[PDB]
Amino acid sequence: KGWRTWEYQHTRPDPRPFPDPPVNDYFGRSRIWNPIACKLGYVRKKADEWGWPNKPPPPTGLRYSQEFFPFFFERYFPDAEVRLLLDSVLNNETKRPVFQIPCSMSKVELVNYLKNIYGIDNVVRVEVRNRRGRRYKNEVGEIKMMDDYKVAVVELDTPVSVELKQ
Amino acid sequence: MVEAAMFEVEKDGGFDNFILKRSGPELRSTYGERIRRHILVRQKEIQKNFVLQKQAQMLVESMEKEILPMEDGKKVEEVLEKYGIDKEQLLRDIARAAVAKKQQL
Amino acid sequence: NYDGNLPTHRAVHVNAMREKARQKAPRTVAGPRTFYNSAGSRANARSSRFGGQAAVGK
Amino acid sequence: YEFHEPLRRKNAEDMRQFQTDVIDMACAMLGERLLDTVNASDTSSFPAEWQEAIAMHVEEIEAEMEEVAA
Amino acid sequence: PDEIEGPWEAYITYDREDGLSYAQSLGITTIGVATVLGLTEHVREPQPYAVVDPVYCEALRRERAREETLMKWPHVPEWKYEYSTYTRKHLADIVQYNYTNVVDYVDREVLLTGKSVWECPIHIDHTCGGSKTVPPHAKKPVRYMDAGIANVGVTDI
Amino acid sequence: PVVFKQGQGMFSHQLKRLLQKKSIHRYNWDPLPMYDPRKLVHASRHMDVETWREVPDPHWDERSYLVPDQMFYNIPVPPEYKDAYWWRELQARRVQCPVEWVSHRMYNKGDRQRYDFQDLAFRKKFEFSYEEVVKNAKDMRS
Amino acid sequence: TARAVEIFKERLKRGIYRYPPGPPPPPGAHDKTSVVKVELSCYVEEERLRELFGRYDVFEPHKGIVRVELKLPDEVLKQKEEAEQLWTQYMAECSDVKAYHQWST
Amino acid sequence: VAPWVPPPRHDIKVTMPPPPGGEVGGRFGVSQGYSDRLARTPYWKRMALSTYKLRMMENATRYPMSEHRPGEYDIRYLPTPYPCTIRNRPLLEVGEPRQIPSIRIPVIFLVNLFDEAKGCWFGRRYETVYVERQFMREELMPQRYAIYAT
Amino acid sequence: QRKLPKHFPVVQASDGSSLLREETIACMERERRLPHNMGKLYSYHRPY
Amino acid sequence: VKYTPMMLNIQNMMWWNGKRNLYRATYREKTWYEISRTGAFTKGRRPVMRQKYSREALQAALAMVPPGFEVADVPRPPQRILAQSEGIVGRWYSNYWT
Amino acid sequence: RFNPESVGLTRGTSAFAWKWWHTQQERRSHRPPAWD
Amino acid sequence: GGFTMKYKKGTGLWDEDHVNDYKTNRYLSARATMRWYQEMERHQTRNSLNARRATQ
Amino acid sequence: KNSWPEWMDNGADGTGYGIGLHRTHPLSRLRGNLKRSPSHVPRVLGMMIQGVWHKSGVKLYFRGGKPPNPSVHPYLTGEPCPLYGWKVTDESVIRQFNMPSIDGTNFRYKPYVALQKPLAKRLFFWR
Amino acid sequence: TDRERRQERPITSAALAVMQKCPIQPQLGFVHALPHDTRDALLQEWERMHHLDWQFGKAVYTPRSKENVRGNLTWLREDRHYDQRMKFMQEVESGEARAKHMKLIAEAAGN
Amino acid sequence: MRISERAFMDIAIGTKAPRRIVFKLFPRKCPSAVKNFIELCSGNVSTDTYESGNRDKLISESALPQLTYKNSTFHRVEKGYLIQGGDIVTGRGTEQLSIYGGTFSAPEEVRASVFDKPGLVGTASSSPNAHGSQFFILTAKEANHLNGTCICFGQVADGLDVVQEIEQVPIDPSGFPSLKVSIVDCGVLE
Numbered sequence A: 001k002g003w004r005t006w007e008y009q010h011t012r013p014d015p016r017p018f019p020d021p022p023v024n025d026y027f028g029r030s031r032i033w034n035p036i037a038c039k040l041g042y043v044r045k046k047a048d049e050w051g052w053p054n055k056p057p058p059p060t061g062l063r064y065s066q067e068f069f070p071f072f073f074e075r076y077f078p079d080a081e082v083r084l085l086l087d088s089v090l091n092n093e094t095k096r097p098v099f100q101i102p103c104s105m106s107k108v109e110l111v112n113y114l115k116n117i118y119g120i121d122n123v124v125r126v127e128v129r130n131r132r133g134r135r136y137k138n139e140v141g142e143i144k145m146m147d148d149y150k151v152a153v154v155e156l157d158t159p160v161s162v163e164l165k166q
Numbered sequence B: 001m002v003e004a005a006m007f008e009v010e011k012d013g014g015f016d017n018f019i020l021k022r023s024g025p026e027l028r029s030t031y032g033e034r035i036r037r038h039i040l041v042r043q044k045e046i047q048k049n050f051v052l053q054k055q056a057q058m059l060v061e062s063m064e065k066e067i068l069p070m071e072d073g074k075k076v077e078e079v080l081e082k083y084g085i086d087k088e089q090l091l092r093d094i095a096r097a098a099v100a101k102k103q104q105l
Numbered sequence C: 001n002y003d004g005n006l007p008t009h010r011a012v013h014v015n016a017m018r019e020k021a022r023q024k025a026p027r028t029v030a031g032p033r034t035f036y037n038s039a040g041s042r043a044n045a046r047s048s049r050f051g052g053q054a055a056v057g058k
Numbered sequence D: 001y002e003f004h005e006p007l008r009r010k011n012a013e014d015m016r017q018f019q020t021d022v023i024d025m026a027c028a029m030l031g032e033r034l035l036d037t038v039n040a041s042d043t044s045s046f047p048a049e050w051q052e053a054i055a056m057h058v059e060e061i062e063a064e065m066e067e068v069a070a
Numbered sequence E: 001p002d003e004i005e006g007p008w009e010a011y012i013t014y015d016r017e018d019g020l021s022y023a024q025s026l027g028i029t030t031i032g033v034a035t036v037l038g039l040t041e042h043v044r045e046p047q048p049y050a051v052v053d054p055v056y057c058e059a060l061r062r063e064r065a066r067e068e069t070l071m072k073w074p075h076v077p078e079w080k081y082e083y084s085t086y087t088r089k090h091l092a093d094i095v096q097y098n099y100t101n102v103v104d105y106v107d108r109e110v111l112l113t114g115k116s117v118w119e120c121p122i123h124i125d126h127t128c129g130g131s132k133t134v135p136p137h138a139k140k141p142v143r144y145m146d147a148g149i150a151n152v153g154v155t156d157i
Numbered sequence F: 001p002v003v004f005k006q007g008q009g010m011f012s013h014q015l016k017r018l019l020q021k022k023s024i025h026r027y028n029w030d031p032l033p034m035y036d037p038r039k040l041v042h043a044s045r046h047m048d049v050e051t052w053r054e055v056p057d058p059h060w061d062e063r064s065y066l067v068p069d070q071m072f073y074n075i076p077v078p079p080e081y082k083d084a085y086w087w088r089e090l091q092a093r094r095v096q097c098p099v100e101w102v103s104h105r106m107y108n109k110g111d112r113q114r115y116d117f118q119d120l121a122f123r124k125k126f127e128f129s130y131e132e133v134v135k136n137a138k139d140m141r142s
Numbered sequence G: 001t002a003r004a005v006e007i008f009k010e011r012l013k014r015g016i017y018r019y020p021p022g023p024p025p026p027p028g029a030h031d032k033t034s035v036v037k038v039e040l041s042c043y044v045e046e047e048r049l050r051e052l053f054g055r056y057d058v059f060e061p062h063k064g065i066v067r068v069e070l071k072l073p074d075e076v077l078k079q080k081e082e083a084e085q086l087w088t089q090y091m092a093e094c095s096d097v098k099a100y101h102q103w104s105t
Numbered sequence H: 001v002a003p004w005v006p007p008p009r010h011d012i013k014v015t016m017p018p019p020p021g022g023e024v025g026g027r028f029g030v031s032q033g034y035s036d037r038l039a040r041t042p043y044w045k046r047m048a049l050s051t052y053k054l055r056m057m058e059n060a061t062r063y064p065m066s067e068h069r070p071g072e073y074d075i076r077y078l079p080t081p082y083p084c085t086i087r088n089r090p091l092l093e094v095g096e097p098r099q100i101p102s103i104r105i106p107v108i109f110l111v112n113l114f115d116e117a118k119g120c121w122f123g124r125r126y127e128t129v130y131v132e133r134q135f136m137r138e139e140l141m142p143q144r145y146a147i148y149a150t
Numbered sequence I: 001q002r003k004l005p006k007h008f009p010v011v012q013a014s015d016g017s018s019l020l021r022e023e024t025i026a027c028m029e030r031e032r033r034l035p036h037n038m039g040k041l042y043s044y045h046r047p048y
Numbered sequence J: 001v002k003y004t005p006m007m008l009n010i011q012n013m014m015w016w017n018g019k020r021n022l023y024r025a026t027y028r029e030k031t032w033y034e035i036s037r038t039g040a041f042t043k044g045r046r047p048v049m050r051q052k053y054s055r056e057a058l059q060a061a062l063a064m065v066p067p068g069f070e071v072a073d074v075p076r077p078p079q080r081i082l083a084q085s086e087g088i089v090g091r092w093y094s095n096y097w098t
Numbered sequence K: 001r002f003n004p005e006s007v008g009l010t011r012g013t014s015a016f017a018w019k020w021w022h023t024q025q026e027r028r029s030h031r032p033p034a035w036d
Numbered sequence L: 001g002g003f004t005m006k007y008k009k010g011t012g013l014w015d016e017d018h019v020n021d022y023k024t025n026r027y028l029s030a031r032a033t034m035r036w037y038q039e040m041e042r043h044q045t046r047n048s049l050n051a052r053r054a055t056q
Numbered sequence M: 001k002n003s004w005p006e007w008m009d010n011g012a013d014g015t016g017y018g019i020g021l022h023r024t025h026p027l028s029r030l031r032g033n034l035k036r037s038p039s040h041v042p043r044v045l046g047m048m049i050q051g052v053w054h055k056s057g058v059k060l061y062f063r064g065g066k067p068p069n070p071s072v073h074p075y076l077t078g079e080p081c082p083l084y085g086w087k088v089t090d091e092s093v094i095r096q097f098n099m100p101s102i103d104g105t106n107f108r109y110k111p112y113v114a115l116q117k118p119l120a121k122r123l124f125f126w127r
Numbered sequence N: 001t002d003r004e005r006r007q008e009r010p011i012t013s014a015a016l017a018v019m020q021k022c023p024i025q026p027q028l029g030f031v032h033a034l035p036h037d038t039r040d041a042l043l044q045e046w047e048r049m050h051h052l053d054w055q056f057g058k059a060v061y062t063p064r065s066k067e068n069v070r071g072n073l074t075w076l077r078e079d080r081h082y083d084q085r086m087k088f089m090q091e092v093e094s095g096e097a098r099a100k101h102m103k104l105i106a107e108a109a110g111n
Numbered sequence O: 001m002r003i004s005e006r007a008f009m010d011i012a013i014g015t016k017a018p019r020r021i022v023f024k025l026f027p028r029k030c031p032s033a034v035k036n037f038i039e040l041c042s043g044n045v046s047t048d049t050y051e052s053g054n055r056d057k058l059i060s061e062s063a064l065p066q067l068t069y070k071n072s073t074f075h076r077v078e079k080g081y082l083i084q085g086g087d088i089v090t091g092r093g094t095e096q097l098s099i100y101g102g103t104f105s106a107p108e109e110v111r112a113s114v115f116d117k118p119g120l121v122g123t124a125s126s127s128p129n130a131h132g133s134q135f136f137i138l139t140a141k142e143a144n145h146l147n148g149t150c151i152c153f154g155q156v157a158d159g160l161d162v163v164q165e166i167e168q169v170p171i172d173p174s175g176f177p178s179l180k181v182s183i184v185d186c187g188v189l190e
């Protein structure tokens, strides 16, 4: 038996189980990165790399070579935020300071960083731990979360310290 | 195929003619596309063999002018070497032609 | 060969259902869609038949 | 180039084999026409060794025909 | 414009290099009502072997394919009403999304000091992060003959 | 392998919202494993026995038929073998998108007149600007 | 990047690259064709030009002709465009004169 | 994504748009052909590249027939842009039984074929004889004793 | 007439170029996550 | 396929349940209601050539007719053929309505 | 009675499945140095 | 779609004639009256210009 | 088969050394098992959430707690080996940070540009 | 091997000149247009015995030099085309082709 | 390298007797290419390994391609244009090799190269900035299309008849010379 389909205007209703937005609203400790890639990611990547669509795309050789601007700038003008935890070397002579490393660096990369940018040439070993970014809530109750980091305990040869004048 | 398609083959005068007359979406069969590729390759090969036979005829009519009297074996072998022909293979095909003539008669 | 604005016979629907049962072999299961397809199998103790699927979502 | 080179190589081999087959078919047709002219005209024969080899090859071909028949 | 037929240039690509010699041997004076003016050899630069080589042409076509793919894909519309629909939030949503104690602290500090403030101490994202969902090359279309009395410039009604 | 079920935990709460993301789409044409198009550039050609390589036949290059392609953008093949690439030509002339995503152009008279619907190629036709229309009408004095 | 891209385009136009390390063959070596430029006073059909300029010794449908390209010079094209604009202005002006003096006669 | 889109089919005119792609050999459903290049070309440029005789030759109409597909009407004049189904239609109609008789087709013989059981000639060399369809298809054609009479 | 709606944030240079649009967006997102001018937070949920 | 969804009168519409039938045209230049309007398709009480030429334009359009042409040569096109007139174009006399 | 296409693979097998169960450089001539 | 008296649309002495206006009010202020005249002229001009653009 | 090596599926070591999602540099020649296709999303999410249970009786990639983020893993730099701990196959991946020296006028440059005391605990600093 | 045979019996300059003076020349690119199928040895050797090589649009290509000529439509077409080529060559060597071409030229000039 | 101004090669057409061709290099205008050519013509392989040395190395130093023009071939020859040869890793005409490494480069030398006279020797390269061991002797009259692509590092002072003799070798369908044109011995005349 058919329905009275001549009484409804041709508009599509909403499905009964309404889908949740793809945006992840959970900011806890088990936050999951979404493996699914969307069109907007590629669009923004092209527009950031070679000014799509106002500029013609560079040839495949330049795009896949080390001279492409992103890789060139990442090599010559590195952007790595290595910050020292003062609670380890402040008014205490310790042999293993603690650093906050971007989660993309490795132990050898951190050793090279400390050896070349600052000159720390006495590094025994590095122990790395991946920690979720520090989350908090402001006065209005909105959930904020800082960038993720990596705790790197760096063992040295000679104990170092920083003296705080009383 | 279908009965109308077989009638159309008989009308066109051959399965190959029917397949080659049908063009693209008119012949929506993948089997038809495969057999059309095969037929095109085989047609090109037949044309190649026709050109080959014409080349052979031209070579024969060019080298017959000197080998017509065949009075001297050395005189014959001079032309055979100038045109690049193996004497043993020539004798073998002469014998094959003789056997074929005996079979025909 | 004209219908005449006449309804279809019952044997037509019977044979259609028989053909559907015969061609019931293939499958349309998708990987990431099984997560939402499993909602028909209410396994959480918070699921209600008359209330719905409201209290089951954390 | 690594994709396209074998194709032109096969084409070159095809041209070489075409020339070889042209030579072979020309030799066969030359033998045919020579035999026809010899068995048609008069006082136009082959040299002694030529006739001997032709007779020997005819014997061999007839033996092969008898073998493939029996 | 039809009265000025003007001279037409016909470039004929002959199969052999004896071009214009066969033409001058023919030596036509008129064809219909055309009255051929002259016959010369079109001087052109010799094309390199790369134009006829299949490997070079395949490489160039591969490069053009990659360029056109990078330019055309993925396709995203320049603008649609859905962008401005989704990027709209209410005032309470804006305040809840972007808010820091900086505004209240600056209010207190300015009340206590007496200085002036010209720019907001905090950047306010009125889209609540929705503008990051709109592609970067977006721009609204030009609408002609809108239904509004605002462009008249009335100052007394 | 990996099965999907309800959850009732935070991982499932995240998955229920993350699996709703629309993955990037790209219309991939049907491959040609049997009839390789770029293999026919060596078909139906004469070769010079002096150097043993093909001859750049201008007539071949002129009468060649272009079969479109996504990674080589097109291939010139002899017109004799062009009948095996009739579906790739349709896929290339068609819009590189599911028709449902652009079907809003066949559901109103304006777009049904402004847009070309041929081989499922939703491409807008030529349209005069309003200034051009006014200019034409005023020059025609009507 | 812009500078290097224009340089590489200029390099590719000349065709100086070859996978087997070696210089490419000279350009005018494989051409084996020529182009004749004919100046006409009126438009002539391409088929007419082909049948009148074709080789009478070639047993092919093209008759030694690869292609025929008809073109208008840039000066003649600009002249045609300016004449079209002037003709539109003239039509509009005569219409306006007629419509303005229709009522005073 | 399509890096190269094939041009409109049979766009070999200077002033007039190409015929419908379905009439040229593409997909049906369109009762009019459109060429983006001809549309973008200004009117003065078309009038400059064309002449009055050429313009009229391109305007030449074949109503109500089609010049690219001979023997049938044009899809732009048919009610639907699809081809008419009165000429090329299935073999049997709806509700019609199959009662087609055994038809005998003409065939050109290539050799002097002599039936020994009946003691008579099938057909002489270069003779057009009417034979059975199945016989010609399965026995005469493979032996190359005869070919179809076309 | 505006080329972008009135509620869109201005992510562009002073001259109008969009060379650092993504960098400006990342800087704004980092500032929203943790502003440098943020005083003493009063909430009972502090990062440390 | 032995029984198509169009037999069982199954209402499959995009605006209704998001489904569409398998055997149908993606695009339809004219809906069934426009095809049934035979008055606007055939030549019924309706003019087909809207250009009304002057006396000199009528005579100029008759000069391009080849000598030896008769009106009885051009038949009336059938009903399923759209009644239209392209105006004074090349070979216009072949058009029955023009 | 004898409806293999209607019954599942656990109850019967079709004729198609029954039938398909059974179904599914350069060269240089070299002569050995042993002989002459 | 459907049948509508296009042969009457635009036949009145002014732009407001033969327009199905069912969104009005018994009292219109100065701004409301200005917008009413603006919308009548805009309806007429948009119809005419869109028809001309489509035809050309 | 799969594009990534088979030790990422089952490490060459008997303990299961070298199991997990490995991200590679775009310009690198090595290939990893981090793929975002609609067919690879299930196993990637499985490795991120459920982990991987080895037949030896241990979870190799994710035992529990905070899930790993394969999008921020440092780029893959080689392959395992039984003799040593790790073979660095791709060296260009590792960021060898190198900065210039005092050569030139580098002794006058400061982090800020010059435009034309006892600290006290405050609640807010504007600038 | 074939390479050894070719190095043993080369092609003479006279034969090569005759073959080049031949009016018609072959085109050798058709082997590249054969449909390619990834078929295993067991499957192909099973089809070869079960007579499935020429079924469902498939076929078996074997290179041939000589072909049976009786009712071969393409051979008859090539023969007629060669006859027309020879007639055209006779015309152009007698000079009537240039005569007809000049007649067309004079007609187009007078018209 | 003013001491080494000319080198020599002994070209053999298959089984024919070796014939000597003598070059003449211009080390002033292009030191890198001339130095590479001289070192390849010299080819000092006097490194003699012993039993214990081979045992501790496990790989003979001769297992890798040696930087010598000896036993090389002329893989690319086209009548009327030039003759190309000098491959180290094999005798087929690909995968160039140099003494500095894989391939060297010299833009200031490439920009000033001019090919206008026959018998001029240049470096056969795929790109203007990837030069190796493969060289070519120009046989044609003038090749002006090679100006900013290759580097002419000298000419031929004796052996033009040898060049014209090895140029007349027929080409086989494999795209290579029908007769193996090889270099049996190379050296330098200091």
Ligand SMILES: [Mg+2]
Residues within 6 Å of the ligand: M049, M050, M063, M064, M065
């Ligand atoms: Mg767990």
